[PDB]
Design an enzyme around this catalytic site. Structure first.
Site, mmCIF file in Angstrom:
data_model
loop_
_atom_site.group_PDB
_atom_site.id
_atom_site.type_symbol
_atom_site.label_atom_id
_atom_site.label_comp_id
_atom_site.label_asym_id
_atom_site.label_seq_id
_atom_site.Cartn_x
_atom_site.Cartn_y
_atom_site.Cartn_z
ATOM 1 N N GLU A 1 23.582 -13.464 10.564
ATOM 2 C CA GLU A 1 24.390 -14.623 10.908
ATOM 3 C C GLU A 1 24.416 -14.745 12.424
ATOM 4 O OE1 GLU A 1 25.422 -16.848 8.930
ATOM 5 O OE2 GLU A 1 24.992 -15.833 7.036
ATOM 6 N N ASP A 2 25.377 -15.493 12.956
ATOM 7 C CA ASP A 2 25.453 -15.784 14.378
ATOM 8 C C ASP A 2 25.545 -14.529 15.245
ATOM 9 O OD1 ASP A 2 25.639 -18.267 13.206
ATOM 10 O OD2 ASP A 2 27.796 -18.464 13.562
ATOM 11 N N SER A 3 25.589 -13.341 14.648
ATOM 12 C CA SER A 3 25.684 -12.123 15.439
ATOM 13 C C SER A 3 24.454 -11.965 16.326
ATOM 14 C CB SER A 3 25.840 -10.903 14.533
ATOM 15 O OG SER A 3 24.692 -10.716 13.728
#
Ligand SMILES: [Zn+2]
Ligand SMILES: [Zn+2]
Ligand SMILES: [Zn+2]
Lengths: 263, 56, 82, 65, 104, 56, 81, 46
Positions: C3-5
């Site tokens: 994800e946006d990590s």
């Protein structure tokens, strides 16, 4: 020898560029990784502050002092603090220096590495000397001081490994490249119309005959040749860096062998 | 409340979970017709499968 | 980084990337009016950081006041926002 | 604040070119690129560390205390 | 304690070795070395979890050839290769440094 | 609504989340500090006194 | 009204959960063990094994809308979950 | 009494104690700056 073959192209004090052949891929990658990671060297670790009437905060100065390169030829002659039976630190396992200054003139005073003073006994070992690659020999810029200020502190440096933390980083950049012509088809070049013109040629491309369009893919070819260029931080001579990395990798393998024998 | 026991949610008769983000993208390339894996690569991949029976 | 990590070069952090000082200040008043009210902080008998500055003054009323500023060093950690 | 000692990615030292860099900018009236090239910063990962730096300590030192 | 060796149960002549405080740097080297041994039937590794420097290596070999002995032979080969590399590199460095004595 | 239909509780933890491909669906990584904060009043029995003895 | 019980002869998921949990509780309370200890230091797994072998001595009283109820032995029931 | 205070707006020390108000003897300010501890401070460069 029958093992890997070496052919240096350029050699300076800062960086060494060479070609390694007659070797597999894993070994070359391991050499790269080791030269980056397990190259025991010296670096400031412990910082004790007497006075700081400077703009910057203490921890800031300690952090910066952590990254100043240091002379480490005889680092092998030095012992890790974690193994030295001395409390806190000892000359046999650590290097003590100090940094003292205070504002004298209305103009700023630039506290540099060359103002670092070696105190503890070096026992003649070529270690602890701050490294200055500057043209004027002024060295790294530790900090600045105004006229009515004062900064005095004591630093202790210990043998450590970049793997543990960056400050022990001995080698800055390792150019690493093989099969520039992409004969092995390990890559599928992204392109809009044609890769032959949309991709620039690597400077090393001139060290092999350009591939022939009419030949079929050599599905048995191995990624044999390799081109490497190591830029030392100045803490160690580049050739010494390569030698130490090779030795460290061989020593890890030997340790595994010894563990097997003990098993 | 154990994870697996809700793989199929009675909300719409659909399993709510699924492959998303990079994992989903990777599958398309892998199973693509133009994909082929060399021996050395396979052995490593096989060992990742925790349930591999040990058969090549 | 599914994800946006995000993946951040660890050694780069150690070389200074995104290091941040963090100053916080505490203030306290010695006591209330002198109208038979007494209290002080003279080491009576029986977060993380260091003391940077300690400032002692008094209000226009003559009551002593103290302000303490402490500081610490944020070192980027997994889960932070960027 | 001041020049960081080392480049974040490369690790190449840069806390010694500040003086000569400012000199070349003013004493030799060169552009940033040519000066940086003269310093040997042959990678943008290291050229950045100087090119983008903002020197604040000059302003902190303005205060008398 | 750094190393642990155990027998696999899903196939014969197969073993699994756990290396503590170790990672790819030597692991991939060892695997590449192993796959050049004819008697080796299978050889691979993996890293269970980045947070730990735990390295898992599985190797299966032909009958009458202890996988541990194959690992020993691979280690010896790696050591000899490194020694030859170092010798050749030292000689090359000396010869090139003769020129670099003037150009540093 | 504020105290009966819901209420502040204990034996709980809250923090930021993250991704982990290497972790089974039915698994979850817990920060060590939290695991050293929450507990469980496990009952002593003949089959677990040894482990409980060591844990204590 | 044990004759002609109109409820299903199968065992309910909620019933499975509560029976297992209660038996685990008794196991933790030094309650009588009914099967061999095969290293299952987990009391809940012991209860699971017991249910697998129908060695749990319990009976469930299912309720109906009107307040009437049926009593079913765990060994009568069919476990398919 | 004790070197606890420094005269803000001046390098001079005040070294005052209880019942000494907060006036700066040379500046007249109400600003005191605690004299820095003489004990040494340890940092691990990192
Ligand atoms: Zn020592
Ligand atoms: Zn760079
Ligand atoms: Zn003053």
């Amino acid at each position: 020898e029958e093992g890997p073959q070496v052919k240096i192209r350029e050699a300076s004090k800062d960086n060494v560029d060479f070609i390694l052949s007659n070797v597999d891929l894993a070994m070359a990658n391991s050499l790269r990784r080791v030269m980056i990671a397990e190259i025991p060297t010296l670096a400031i670790d412990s910082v004790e502050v007497e006075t700081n009437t400077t703009v910057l905060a203490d921890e800031f100065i300690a952090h910066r002092l952590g990254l100043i390169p240091l002379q480490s030829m005889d680092i092998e002659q030095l012992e890790y603090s974690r193994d030295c039976f001395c409390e806190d630190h000892c000359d046999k396992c650590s290097v003590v220096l100090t940094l003292q200054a205070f504002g004298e003139s209305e103009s700023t005073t630039n506290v540099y590495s060359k103002d670092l003073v070696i105190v503890s006994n070096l026992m003649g070992r070529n270690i602890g000397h701050p490294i200055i690659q500057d043209k004027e020999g002024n060295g790294v810029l530790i900090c600045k001081l105004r006229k009515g200020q004062e900064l005095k502190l004591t630093c202790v440096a210990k043998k450590g490994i970049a793997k543990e933390h960056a400050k022990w980083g001995p080698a800055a950049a390792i150019e690493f490249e093989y099969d520039p012509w992409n004969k092995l088809k390990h890559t599928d070049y992204w392109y809009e119309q044609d890769s032959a013109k949309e991709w620039p040629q690597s400077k090393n491309c001139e060290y092999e005959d350009p591939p022939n369009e009419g030949d079929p893919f050599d599905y048995k070819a191995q990624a044999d040749t390799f081109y490497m260029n190591v830029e030392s931080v100045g803490s160690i001579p580049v050739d010494q860096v390569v030698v130490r990395g090779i030795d460290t990798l061989q020593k890890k393998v030997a340790s595994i062998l010894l563990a097997l024998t003990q098993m | 409340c154990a994870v697996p026991l809700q793989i199929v949610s009675p909300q719409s008769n659909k399993p709510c979970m699924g492959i998303v983000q990079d994992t989903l993208c990777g599958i398309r390339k892998l199973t693509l017709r133009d994909t082929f894996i060399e021996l050395d690569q396979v052995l490593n991949m096989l060992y990742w499968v925790p349930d591999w029976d040990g058969v090549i | 980084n599914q994800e946006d990590s995000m993946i951040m070069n660890q050694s780069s952090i150690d070389r200074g990337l995104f290091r941040s000082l963090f100053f916080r200040s505490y203030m306290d008043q010695e006591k209330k009016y002198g109208m038979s009210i007494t209290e002080t902080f003279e080491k009576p008998q029986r977060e993380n950081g260091i003391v940077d500055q300690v400032l002692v003054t008094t209000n226009q009323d003559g009551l002593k006041f103290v302000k303490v500023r402490v500081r610490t060093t944020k070192i980027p950690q997994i889960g932070d926002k960027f | 604040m001041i020049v960081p000692v080392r480049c974040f990615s490369c690790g190449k030292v840069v806390g010694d070119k500040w003086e000569s860099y400012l000199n070349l900018l003013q004493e030799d009236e060169l552009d940033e690129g040519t000066a940086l090239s003269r310093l040997g910063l042959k990678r943008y990962c290291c050229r950045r560390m100087i090119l983008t730096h903002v020197d604040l300590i000059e302003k902190f030192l303005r205060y008398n205390p | 304690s750094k190393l642990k060796i155990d027998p696999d149960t899903k196939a014969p002549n197969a073993v699994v070795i756990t290396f503590e405080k170790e990672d790819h740097t030597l692991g991939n080297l060892i695997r590449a070395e192993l796959l050049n041994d004819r008697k080796v039937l299978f050889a691979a590794y993996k890293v269970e979890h980045p947070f730990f420097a735990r390295f898992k290596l599985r190797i299966q070999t032909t009958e009458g050839y202890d996988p541990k002995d194959a690992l020993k032979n691979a280690c010896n080969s790696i050591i000899n290769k490194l020694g030859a590399l170092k010798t050749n590199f030292e000689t090359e460095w000396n010869l090139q440094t003769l020129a670099a004595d003037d150009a540093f | 609504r504020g105290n009966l239909m819901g209420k502040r509780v204990d034996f709980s933890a809250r923090t930021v989340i993250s991704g982990d491909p290497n972790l089974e669906l039915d698994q979850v990584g817990v920060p060590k500090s939290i695991a050293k904060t929450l507990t469980y009043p496990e009952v002593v029995t003949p089959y677990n006194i040894d482990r409980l003895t060591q844990l204590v | 009204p044990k004759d002609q019980r109109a409820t299903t002869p199968y065992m309910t998921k909620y019933e499975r959960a509560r029976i297992l949990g209660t038996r685990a509780l008794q196991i933790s309370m030094n309650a009588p063990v009914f099967v061999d200890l095969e290293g299952e230091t987990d009391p809940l797994r012991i209860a699971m094994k017991e249910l697998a072998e129908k060695k749990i001595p319990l009976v469930i009283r299912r309720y109906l809308p009107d307040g009437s109820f049926e009593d079913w032995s765990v060994e009568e029931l069919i476990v398919d979950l | 009494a004790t070197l606890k205070y420094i005269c803000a707006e001046c390098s001079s020390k005040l070294s005052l104690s209880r019942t000494d108000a907060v006036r700066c003897k040379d500046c007249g300010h109400r600003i005191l700056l605690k004299a820095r501890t003489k004990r040494l401070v340890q940092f691990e460069a990192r």
